[PDB]
Amino acid sequence: KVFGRCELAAAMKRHGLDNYRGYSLGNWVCAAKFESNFNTQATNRNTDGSTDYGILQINSRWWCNDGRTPGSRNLCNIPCSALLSSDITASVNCAKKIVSDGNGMNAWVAWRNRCKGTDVQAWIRGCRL
Ligand SMILES: [Cl-]
Ligand SMILES: [Cl-]
Ligand SMILES: [Cl-]
């Protein structure tokens, strides 16, 4: 599924991401924009052989099992395919664990390089929240 911008904002808010760990909703929407282009089915292979999955490009190196990342962990205790569902619950639940791990949203390289320090409000502007 390719979410609309306000559509994703609404789902992220209902799942309690708005201000989770102090990060306002626009930060999460901006991160999804540049991690996945709002596409739940996005996958991208990392240099180390791990793969990033889903709307928030969650990495098999630490957070999910894909059976092809030898030596990795599965800290969210889910198959990485669950992070590709049309329903974002799995991805949100796992993102909450990631952003609590100590480094905040810096875990998302696209957020650090393209959202952090910008007017992230713009990503929710005009949405009925
Ligand atoms: Cl915001
Ligand atoms: Cl594996
Ligand atoms: Cl933080």
UniProtKB/Swiss-Prot annotation:
Enzyme Commission code: 3.2.1.17
UniProt note on tissues of expression: In the egg white and polymorphonuclear leukocytes.
Cystines in this chain: 6-127, 30-115, 64-80, 76-94
Annotated active site: 35, 52
SUPFAM superfamilies given in the database record: Lysozyme-like
Keyword Disulfide bond assigned: yes
GO biological process: cell wall macromolecule catabolic process; defense response to bacterium; defense response to Gram-negative bacterium; defense response to Gram-positive bacterium; killing of cells of another organism
One example GO MF annotation: beta-N-acetylglucosaminidase activity
Keyword vocabulary terms for this entry: Allergen, Antimicrobial, Bacteriolytic enzyme, Disulfide bond, Glycosidase, Hydrolase, Secreted, Signal
Localization terms from the record: Secreted
Residues involved in substrate binding: 101
Subunit structure: Monomer.
Function: Lysozymes have primarily a bacteriolytic function; those in tissues and body fluids are associated with the monocyte-macrophage system and enhance the activity of immunoagents. Has bacteriolytic activity against M.luteus.
Protein name: Lysozyme C
Organism encoding this protein: Gallus gallus
Encoding gene (name): LYZ
